[PDB]
Amino acid sequence: PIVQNLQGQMVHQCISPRTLNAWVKVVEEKAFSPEVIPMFSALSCGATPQDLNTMLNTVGGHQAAMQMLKETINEEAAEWDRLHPVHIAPGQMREPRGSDIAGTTSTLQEQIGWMTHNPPIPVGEIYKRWIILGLNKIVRMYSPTSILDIRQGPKEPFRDYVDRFYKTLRAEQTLLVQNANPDCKTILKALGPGATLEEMMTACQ
Amino acid sequence: PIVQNLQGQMVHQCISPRTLNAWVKVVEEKAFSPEVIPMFSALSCGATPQDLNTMLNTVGGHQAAMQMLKETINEEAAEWDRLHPVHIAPGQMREPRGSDIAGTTSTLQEQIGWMTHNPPIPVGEIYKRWIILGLNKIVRMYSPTSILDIRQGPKEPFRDYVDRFYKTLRAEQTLLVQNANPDCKTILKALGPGATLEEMMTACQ
Amino acid sequence: PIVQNLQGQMVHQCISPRTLNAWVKVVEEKAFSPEVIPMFSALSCGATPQDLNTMLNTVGGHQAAMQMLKETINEEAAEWDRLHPVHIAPGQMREPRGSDIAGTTSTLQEQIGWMTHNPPIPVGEIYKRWIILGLNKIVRMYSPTSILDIRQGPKEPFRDYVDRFYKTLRAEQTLLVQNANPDCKTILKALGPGATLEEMMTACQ
Amino acid sequence: PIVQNLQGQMVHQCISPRTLNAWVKVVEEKAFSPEVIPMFSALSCGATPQDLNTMLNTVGGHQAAMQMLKETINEEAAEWDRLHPVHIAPGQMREPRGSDIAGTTSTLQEQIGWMTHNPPIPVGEIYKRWIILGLNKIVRMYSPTSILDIRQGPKEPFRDYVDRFYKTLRAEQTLLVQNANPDCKTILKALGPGATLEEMMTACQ
Amino acid sequence: PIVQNLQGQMVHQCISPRTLNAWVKVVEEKAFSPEVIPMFSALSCGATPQDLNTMLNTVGGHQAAMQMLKETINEEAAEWDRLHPVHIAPGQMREPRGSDIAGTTSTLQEQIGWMTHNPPIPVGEIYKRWIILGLNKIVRMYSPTSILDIRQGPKEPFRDYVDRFYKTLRAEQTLLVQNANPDCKTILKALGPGATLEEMMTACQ
Amino acid sequence: PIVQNLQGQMVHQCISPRTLNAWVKVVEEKAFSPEVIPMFSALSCGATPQDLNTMLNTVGGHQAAMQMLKETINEEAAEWDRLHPVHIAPGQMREPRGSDIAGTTSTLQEQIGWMTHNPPIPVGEIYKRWIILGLNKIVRMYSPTSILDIRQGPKEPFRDYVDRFYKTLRAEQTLLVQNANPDCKTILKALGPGATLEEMMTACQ
Ligand SMILES: O=P(O)(O)O[C@H]1[C@H](OP(=O)(O)O)[C@@H](OP(=O)(O)O)[C@H](OP(=O)(O)O)[C@@H](OP(=O)(O)O)[C@H]1OP(=O)(O)O
């Protein structure tokens, strides 16, 4: 990553073993549950394209997902190249292409040079947006169940039903009342319209 | 978070993997037991709105609770907007709206700019107050038992009863004597009024 | 806590996740065994009143003990207010009351201001003394056995007996010879007076 | 490794116990699965030849692999010596030979001297390229199965098949359709040409 | 402890939770095996008397041992007071007594003042010598077996016997040949005098 | 150890609990497998003689080995004294003897003084060479099997045989073909001379 030292210049620091290990574990434990994406974003704070490639490449399973992600990255890179065509002056900074942003045709020195320029060309932030676009599609694809099949069981506590319902909506990126069991549905119908979630959960407790 | 370096300027630092992992674990282990709230407050010391959103978004379960929290945050944001209406001068700091404080319509650069201004606009401290308001309502809602149902068993040591009693009061946010078993109740009645808790526990040992 | 940086000014630092987790675990594992108190004192080195409240508030069980501690803290605060009455000049440091020292009516900024003043008002050290007074009473109360009931068994090695004896004395805050078994008691009587513990343990080995 | 301190000079730092332990574990757990190579590259960021030799030498098993790697390193060193022949001036920097780059005939002081020269001779980056060449050959050799033997089972979900297929291709460094089961193959044939992987996985879900 | 910062002044630093936890564990796992003493010495590098008392006081068991240690410390303190009698000038450093060195009648500020004086009065190093004197007596006392009872079994490999023999000598602070079994004893007698341990172990392999 | 701070002077730092614990564990887990030696060398980077003695003394078992090591160290120290005889000028640096290099008759202050002198007397590097000489003899002695007894089993995969073969050669510090089973031996004989290990392993797969 690129960090500010104790004296206030932006410098390159090695990715820590703690960071590397945290990412690999979360993917092992959680696969592409939606909460993996904000964890990815937090663990890659200040990342260079080189560091982002490290994090993706260190994943050993889920290789269908990692191929789908490469495809998304190649589409965003090709759209970058459409919007930002490029033409080198000795000693001067060249303009990045899509494949430079994705870290496949650029060196770590060029990446640092772009990211610490005045004004900077935030190649790490741009690449991370492409990656997250790709990861969101994977989360959606790996979602096991439609929101239409989340219905409250006859003996299921309302809180447990709402937890399943919002967990599914999150992964898929009045239905709550419609899919409630007969007993809660009655209670909820009687609350009247524009009830908060707190009020519905209180009523059905 | 925003920290002071070794040379005494306020600078942005990445959220640590240690911090991220501590929060996720405590929610996995403790759910919305009341002691989770002072842990949240301690783990988010110096946080930007971006960092607070990271911590909330990295929770994978309890999605009914996290929806209730979004609702509370939207109410506080709307009250902010009532009290502090806003109208940009090139290069100058804009005034934050509710959604800027909650980190949904502001960038990390704007958040740092507000929090390190002279004088600062403590957007992270303001947002954290809204979050804690929301978390306290959740703790109260998830409290399993009324204080009225905490009564000392015929064979239950007085200390164990008092522990259950104050654990429940804490989550719900002379009753102690009234709910004691016959044997302790006698002892306690005879101590006379304005006995300390130490004196009651000593007497019933 | 308040620490000296690498350049020698006293500055505020966030409580670490390592510190927070160490305290919670030691209370989970050891409850109010006497050795918990020197651990508390070591983990709270340089603490502000805010940090001390964090550490106490993050404990989830033992809520009878934490209520007894609040009582002790309120007594010490009221005695502070007796000895040090208070009357604000724009921009000037106000004098702390008992409730300021205990961190309930003071901000973190005021606490840092007191603790780093020339000369300082060590509000964190004062509060920590009150807490430790309260914790010692709890250790004493939770002591399972009287020293009078620690007697050496007919087959118990003398070393194991002495370990139980001094473990109990520590928690309760010639008896050793009197409570020894017949065989050691004989040996010990014959050593004559003013024998060291090393000499008694050697003799009874 | 060679790192920049807080004041911006390139200095030598000891390899951390965290780094050493991370590498040894990943080799214990993953052997020569392909994802071990990007982990090696990330854990050896800024490494001297001495540090790279440490990491290789601390591996206790897989000694057939570590002998094959020595062979590859000796070939690259001999090609270095072909391209860059060498001839010492008192106090002056000598030119490195292949065996200097691999750290067997150079001291740590010479290695730092080369790597921090203006302009630098990046002996650590050169050696790491040789090592990675050698590691890729080992990954290929230890690949258990040909891509030709990865075929979708009659009851195997398409996603699980694609995961095995791309895991194998990765280690070996229209076949996907040809090796699909009869049911998916039909669906896939009907999609028409130039379907993305996302579209094939959606269709076969 | 007292450490040098990044800028080269000697300053006080809080004892780390890592240090505190390492000590407590090693005593839990190893009791007073001899290797506990060099671990104590390494974990207390730069310690103040306050820090040394922390480390001793955080031990929960072995209270017979910790009482024996207090006795040894009181003897060394009384001998200090014999050799170095003391008589305060406003603002000036007082001379330490035995009980000041052991940290019972001195403040942390006085301890830092002594240890960082020019020239320094190394109260932490002096106290640590007293503690180690006391710990060595405990190791000796807790030694389970006399060296006279370490004899090689008829089926015991010579290496395993030598390991037990030197483990015992270490704790107790030609016998090796005399206590060998008949078969090795013959081999060893025939080697002739002034054989190294390597030669004896080779011969008996 | 002696490290460079953030400002570029060589200063003494305490051995870390992480370092201490890593060494003790690796000896517990691996005994004197050959890979323990490069781990020792990496964990003792920048060590003073005091730090090296700490690491050796913290090992609790293998006391026959640690006695053999003391013997080797005493031989190297006596050869040092032969090559470098010594004769003190008030305030001046004395010349080190063998026992000074091994840290038994020198203080930590003298050791730092030598190691940071201009030019330095690298007492830590010299002692570490003696230790490693001693450790290599121990690895050799504890090697369980002769290379002559490593032969490929009739059902043993060639890769597994080569792993055992090079693991043994490493500890002992055309035989490969001679000790192969009949089936591989045939294949290998037919490859012709000067085949690489990669080619032999490919052929026998
Ligand atoms: O790995 P160790 O040598 O035991 O030391 C570590 C380590 O910090 P260093 O990288 O400076 O060694 C940690 O880093 P990670 O391995 O987790 O990346 C860190 O944990 P944090 O990341 O949360 O800082 C930590 O400190 P903590 O005590 O807060 O766990 C600390 O251990 P000690 O400071 O106790 O020695």
Residue numbers in the entry:
A (entry chain A), B (entry chain A), C (entry chain A), D (entry chain A), E (entry chain A), F (entry chain A): 1 to 87, 91 to 176, 188 to 219
Q: How is this structure described in the published paper?
A:
As predicted, IP6 strongly stabilised capsid hexamers, moreover to a substantially greater degree than ATP. A concentration of 20 µM IP6 gave approximately half maximal stabilisation to a solution of 33 µM hexamer. This suggests that hexamer stabilisation by IP6 is likely stoichiometric, with one IP6 molecule per hexamer. We hypothesised that the remarkable capsid stabilisation achieved by IP6 is likely because the abundant negatively charged groups allow highly efficient coordination and charge neutralisation of the six arginine side-chains in the pore. The electron density for the complex confirmed that IP6 binds the R18 ring and six symmetry copies of IP6 at partial occupancy were an excellent fit to the data. The N-terminal β-hairpin of the hexamer adopts a ‘closed’ conformation in the IP6 complex, with IP6 itself located within the central chamber, above the R18 ring. Despite the fact that IP6 is not planar and does not bind parallel to the R18 ring, alternate R18 conformers allow each arginine within the hexamer the potential for hydrogen bond or electrostatic interactions with a phosphate. The structure therefore indicates that IP6 is tightly bound by the R18 pore, would effectively neutralise the abundant positive charge and is likely to coordinate and maintain hexamer assembly.
A ring of arginine residues (R18) within the pore avidly binds dNTPs, potentially explaining nucleotide transport into the capsid interior to fuel RT.
